[PDB]
Design a protein around this ligand. Structure first.
Ligand SMILES: *[C@@H]1O[C@H](CO)[C@@H](O[C@@H]2O[C@H](CO)[C@@H](O[C@@H]3O[C@H](CO[C@H]4O[C@H](CO)[C@@H](O)[C@H](O)[C@@H]4O)[C@@H](O)[C@H](O)[C@@H]3O)[C@H](O)[C@H]2NC(C)=O)[C@H](O)[C@H]1NC(C)=O
Ligand SMILES: *[C@@H]1O[C@H](CO)[C@@H](O)[C@H](O)[C@H]1NC(C)=O
Lengths: 97, 241
């Protein structure tokens, strides 16, 4: 039918919901952003410089049986934040199911 | 329910510069705009969903709660609408440029007389922006017409005490006027705390060639339940319940 995603509300400023990457699903929270078109989560291979990554959930490819590597680099600049990493392929689940 | 989108390309972030994600409670972003603005032409998640024919209608709707202590905090509905969260009927607007969800705004009128964007302008509907944003010059006029004071960098503050004396602002979209009352467009914030309400309009210039653009963020999507239609490239709004 329609698939409901429940969103959390942080201070009427951040609304995010939970999704899974991998088999079995590793759960992450993301904002469903209608202002961009890329999906990204922190890598467990994020560099030490990436302070943000220390305090968030990181994705580990080696724990997913359906992961297909891609490795191509990407660099996204939002009108606020900037990030970069490499691309990868796997199943995305919404909710973390 | 639950969908499995298979074979999705997504990025593993390794460097994330600045304060901006240290402070964010979320782990990542799942972008839901059209493919044109996709970095590396990576097919978006909802495009992948449509292609694998995972839902009946290629639409998704956003209910966002404007009370932070509410359960649930909002609800994204994929492939449908949730009528338990809106009143009356959806009124739709067509996407002008198919990249962000771009819609044409007819004018912004603040009831004390001031009309901004007279001549009409372009606006994007962005669930990832908290505030309403518009061009620096028009937003300073709007803020002076409501009496908010500058905080820093295009953000303005108003005493929470003063919010009931404030004008309502109406954005006219596709001939209809959508009203934001003072409680819809101001946010309470705290550190020492309370009495500190942000004016929900931020002044930021978005440069050519994409801009100028007003952004209808979570302040608007929180009063008006929003429907993004990929099947017919239009956006629909109804009063959230
Ligand atoms: C990593 O990611 C992908 C899957 O693992 C593969 O890389 C990407 O593959 C897609 C196809 O799925 C390519 O995108 C296509 O681009 C063409 C051409 O685009 C035209 O339009 C743009 C503007 O809209 C214009 O600037 C161009 O000049 C073209 O005129 C489209 O016809 C397709 O619909 C689709 O969008 C990507 O280009 C490609 N990305 C990159 C960075 O290579 C690839 O298999 C994987 N990488 C590896 C090494 O395996
Ligand atoms: C939307 O586009 C159609 C054609 O696709 C046009 O005839 C219609 O009047 C437009 N309506 C709105 C509400 O933008």
């Amino acid at each position: 039918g329609p698939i409901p995603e429940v969103l959390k509300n942080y201070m009427d400023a951040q609304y995010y919901g939970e999704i899974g990457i991998g088999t079995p699903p590793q759960c992450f929270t993301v904002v469903f952003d209608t202002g961009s078109s890329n999906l990204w989560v922190p890598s467990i291979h994020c560099k030490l410089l990436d302070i943000a990554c220390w305090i968030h959930h990181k994705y580990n490819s080696d724990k997913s049986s359906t992961y297909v590597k891609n490795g191509t680099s990407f660099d996204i600049h939002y009108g606020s934040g900037s990030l970069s990493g490499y691309l990868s392929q796997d199943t995305v689940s919404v909710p973390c199911q | 329910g639950g969908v499995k989108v298979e074979r999705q390309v997504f990025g593993e972030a390794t460097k994330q510069p600045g304060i901006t994600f240290i402070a964010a409670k979320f782990d990542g972003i799942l972008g839901m705009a059209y493919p044109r603005i996709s970095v590396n032409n990576v097919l978006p998640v909802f495009d992948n969903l449509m292609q694998q024919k995972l839902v009946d209608q290629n639409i998704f709707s956003f209910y966002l709660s404007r009370d932070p202590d509410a359960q649930p905090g909002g609800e994204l509905m994929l492939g449908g609408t949730d009528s338990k969260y809106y009143k009356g009927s959806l009124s739709y607007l067509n996407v002008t440029r198919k990249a962000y969800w771009q819609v044409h705004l007819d004018q912004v009128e603040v009831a004390s007389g001031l009309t901004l964007c007279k001549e009409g302008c372009e606006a994007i509907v962005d669930t990832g922006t908290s505030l309403m944003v518009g061009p620096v010059d028009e937003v300073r006029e709007l803020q002076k017409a409501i009496g908010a004071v500058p905080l820093i960098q295009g953000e303005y503050m108003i005493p929470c005490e003063k919010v009931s004396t404030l004008p309502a602002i109406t954005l006219k979209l596709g001939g209809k006027g959508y009203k934001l009352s003072p409680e819809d467009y101001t946010l309470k914030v705290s550190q020492a705390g309370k009495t500190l309400c942000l004016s929900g309009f931020m002044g930021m210039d978005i440069p050519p060639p994409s801009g100028p653009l007003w952004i209808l963020g979570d302040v608007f999507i929180g009063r008006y339940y929003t429907v993004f239609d990929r099947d017919n490239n239009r956006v629909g709004f109804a009063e959230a319940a």
